[PDB]
């Protein structure tokens, strides 16, 4: 960096600021989306959140009320599938490398 000589500026905020922003957004993602308008806050437990979100897209309440465990296991394996997925096959990882 100095052999030719050029500065590399650090980013505008320290890593803890990004950590705080992501933590706040992850803590609010369960609560913002329950009612139109962002004045109120609805920090529901995440189970009832995903129940209502999956109900609103064309699922009757009966099947979600009787089959919490199977959809929960499906959610768990779906989230765990991408832990080992970081390879060349990931488009977003390739864009990060690019």
């Amino acid at each position: 960096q100095y052999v030719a000589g050029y500065k590399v500026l650090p980013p505008l905020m320290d890593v803890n600021m990004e950590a705080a922003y992501t933590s706040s957004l992850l803590g609010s993602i369960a609560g913002v989306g329950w009612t139109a308008g962002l004045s109120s806050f609805a920090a529901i437990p995440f189970a009832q959140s995903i129940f209502y979100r999956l109900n609103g897209v064309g699922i009757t309440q009966q099947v979600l009320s009787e089959n919490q465990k199977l959809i929960a296991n499906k959610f768990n394996q779906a989230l765990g599938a991408m832990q080992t997925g970081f390879t060349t096959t990931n488009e977003a990882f390739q864009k990060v490398q690019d």
Partner: protein, 44 residues
Amino acid sequence: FIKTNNEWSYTGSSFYAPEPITSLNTKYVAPQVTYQNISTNLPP
């Protein structure tokens, strides 16, 4: 408004699960020619 082999029933839009119709999943709309007629088993 699914037909059953188990006489209509209700199903949603993203999972196959027939279940009996109520007032909780329909709306009263003015008639059209293409709507089916029934006079045997009245829905609730």
